[PDB]
Symmetry: D2
Subunit: 326 residues, 4 copies
């Protein structure tokens, strides 16, 4: 049977409450060993090894953890046939894209979580974890980038996002769709991401202990420019605007970001709107102000790419080209 390493970070898949039917719980309390032992069927499909990396709610995910995960995967690539990462669902879409750009291992890297705690009635985590190991053990899963497996579906790390606060079926690749569906332990793959990922990117975090500082500001009617000003005064390397509509900015925020771009802060226009691209050639003249349009990357994913872009260059033209290729 294939050797599959489970790297555990916490999340509701490792969460517990006092009652099967009350909704209150805490995430990241159950160890990886107890996750594995609770699905004895794993032993028939894989030779499983579990490692606890951290045990937190992914609302508390941070750069230190990202860096650790990428180096761990790249270091151990040759010692296993695939990886499964258990993780909270709240920022899974961020971690998954970060690894999609920095992992240099060609073997399957599959992330998995649960929307209901392990103690819940009809808990979704056991069958998710099962399907994640199936996916990581399948030869067809290699070379597709970092993957997220939830609710019988295989999604790519770039497009996948959380679309509902509570539904087990919340994860969807809302612009370009999923890669495959799983039924009876077999995967019907009909798609693979076209944008460059993993060993095909120039991003290498093997020697880094810190990432550039990138913040996000939200736009809405009568938006305060105070959040944007605070990031600039604190010397942030980049700002991502969660803009309204097609990446548009409220007047005061636009003014602050235009000034910031001229003094060297990288600025990316994204959108609070959940689907579709923030494009060039709409209402904002990006070339005039030195802004970058994020394309289909939502604000939190645009932050991930901008941080990595900032380790290579500070030129907006160059950053735009990166946003057009990854």
């Amino acid at each position: 049977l294939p050797n599959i390493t489970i790297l555990a970070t916490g999340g509701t898949i490792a969460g517990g409450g006092d009652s099967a039917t009350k909704s209150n719980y805490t995430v990241g309390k159950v160890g990886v060993e107890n996750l594995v032992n609770a699905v004895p069927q794993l032993k028939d499909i894989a030779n499983v090894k579990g490692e606890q990396v951290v045990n937190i709610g992914s609302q508390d995910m941070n750069d230190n953890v990202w860096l650790t995960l990428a180096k761990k995967i790249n270091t151990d690539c040759d010692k296993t046939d695939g990886f499964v990462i258990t993780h909270g669902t709240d920022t899974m879409e961020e971690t998954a894209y970060f690894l999609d750009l920095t992992v240099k291992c060609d073997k399957p890297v599959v992330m998995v979580g649960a929307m209901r705690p392990s103690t819940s009635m009809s808990a979704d985590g056991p069958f998710n974890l099962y399907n994640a190991v199936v996916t990581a053990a399948d030869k067809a899963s290699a070379n597709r980038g970092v993957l997220v497996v939830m609710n019988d579906t295989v999604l790519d790390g770039r497009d996948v996002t959380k679309t509902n606060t509570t539904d087990v079926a919340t994860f969807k690749s809302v612009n370009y769709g999923p890669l495959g569906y799983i039924h009876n332990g077999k995967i019907d793959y009909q798609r693979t991401p076209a944008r460059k990922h993993t060993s095909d990117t120039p991003f290498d975090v093997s020697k880094l202990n810190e990432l550039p500082k990138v913040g996000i500001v939200y736009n809405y009617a009568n938006a305060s420019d105070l959040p944007a000003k605070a990031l600039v005064d604190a010397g942030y390397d980049g700002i991502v605007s969660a803009g309204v509509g097609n990446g548009n900015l409220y007047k005061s925020v636009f003014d602050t970001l235009a000034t910031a771009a001229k003094t060297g802060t990288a600025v990316v226009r994204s959108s609070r709107v959940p689907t579709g691209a923030t494009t060039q050639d709409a209402e904002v003249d990006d070339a005039k102000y030195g802004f970058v349009a994020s394309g289909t990357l939502n604000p939190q994913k645009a932050r991930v790419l901008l941080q990595l872009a900032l380790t290579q260059t500070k030129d907006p033209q160059q950053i735009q080209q990166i946003f057009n290729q990854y």
Copy 2:
């Protein structure tokens, strides 16, 4: 024929570019008179009167404009059979909910926009504006709250949101669905909002010249607490958190907001996730910290209700009850 007043505020429905096939344009450049004259079919269904209120891109929408629109509608209620408001699509979902809570006129108030500029090939604005007048003239539309008409569909002001950056079909009521569909100028209504609206709310802005100051902060992996701190130091009356997952907060932001709530700042937990409710009884003990859970209101709509709540009370228990009724 019925008397319908069009109150124009700008938007891409009044926007223009230099080419039918290039995507570049400016919003809010065409006067209301030219909008009306460009759809001569209006004259067969309604006695139309146009008034220009402002002419801006709704990315620049603000409290002054909201206040003006509500008082204008309430003042002129008895002089017309219905209202149509033309407006940019980027913040239409905010304005529509603000009017939904403050308009005291029982006659139909219908908002309408366009995703493609008036100069575009296959411009959607002419047929939208036609259907909006149809909806405002229909007796069945009364008493349903403020309405948004886009792409042959009648949506309620509370649930409606922009779901795509560029698609003509972008507006959807993503939690509870639309009220009606329009075909051949007739409306099949099968739903009406249950939450209290218009003349059934206690919100009255007739004597107000200013609203309480409410800002929004975004959460993501490694989120900065600097945006939250800046709002607090500037003495904001309320903050809305666009949280991850089911309204969760990154550790540093949670710390700052908990401290702020104890010194009197109203705090509401919402979610960057586009559908579903931010609930109580999940991972955050709202009663312990004095926080309010926003339910299905997304961050920008939760700001609208919080501002109005703050003109009546500062008690979190009371504000939670308001979030449970409106």
Copy 3:
């Protein structure tokens, strides 16, 4: 505690396979007693009584079982506080609409099923059944018509349909949305159906032992008229066309159904397209041919309303009026 009656009819909720991880299974093998004893927490929210009506896969649902169910609910209405019906998911949407038009009981009637068999890892039936009893016990559920509770959502019997062959989240009300969402045993209801239902219809099956015969034919490129002809030659009372697009018919099928409508067969145009209404006033002059347009009813739901209309009248004008009101 409320008294709740569970009427069991079979389905995958009562289905079983030989392995927790293989997909093969048979439906309708587990008795109602075992279903209930498997969810001990029901006894905290209701006094439950189980009755086995039949035990089948709902792909074999038929008129005799529908008539039995309606009569049994109407007869026992005053002996209980609410009903839950366990049922397969394949024709759940048909039965729910049939009961929505023939149940004269004012108490909540809630249907529930499961997409995974009871022996499956992460089986969804136990939490669905728990939620269905919560909904049947909730006073706010009354007077909303017959309801389907699946995946934490409360759906009305008219609009609900199965949208995916295998997903636990397959049930959606795809035209007008759900009525309510359940979280921690509490239901946020924001909608109720406007079309008339249960006690407000004129359909009474108390004295009927059979229903009018109504069959469905499908349209596609180069469609055979043989299926249509076979139903007319057999003397069917009505035929529903699952048309292409907005209820259109392939030419040979058109000719056959136009002739049948003239010699007295009732003909309803519906559509194989999963959302949106089949309307009047498009490419087919229904008035000339005596055809009825089904509005948002899909073919299998149109068949339900046509059968019941045919117990009251055979006039196409009157039938159109029924399709406009229920």
Copy 4:
């Protein structure tokens, strides 16, 4: 400038009504010359040549028109840089898949239609046709199989389906998503279909003047087996069942099709449910009965693949293999 050939077949894109605001219209009345002259901007992006093949509503599409189209494209492949086919939207999804399996030309083949007639206010056909020519002229479009361009989106011919009866946004690839989105004349392609298409299939219709006869029967509660029986008695080569749920059949229809599969009729199980695969290994033992499971092909698309498979083989094992590869 590229040379692009438009092959016109009719449809609402070529449809006309008496009023810009009434919904009534007839399809297939405007000639190709008038379609092209109505979009003068085409001459800036391509050298266009129009040919009228037929002029019908696509509800009357048939095998003879399919065979004509495939042969005409394969014959003229080397005389042009790309093809656009104008077509009604009702069976667009059928024709596109048929051409996807039989076109041996490597150049882009793009289908396009309109949901509103050309005389309608805000008619969508002109911008769709413009975008379809842009797509056919783009080098990046080649080798992606046959494409459907509607509402600024590029969809593959296998997964695309009509999801709504009247919405301009009705076309979606509901299982695996779209290939690309068009903005300002530029296409962001992120996906290509994995299933084999065009020159990589063994289907060759160059010498055929008819196709095997394959009909479709629908399942629902109390379904009549008469439609199935009529097609068997008439000697049909194959029957596709639009099954309930995951390809299930009402008992009488099951018995009839199991008997037909034994006396040589090819039987494919598909589903009336609009998304998801009909799988093996659920409730029906296909191997015992000689049935084929259609996977994500819906009934009208399964009929297309079954007809073409039947020109190569009659063995159900081989046919299953074809359904697994194309």
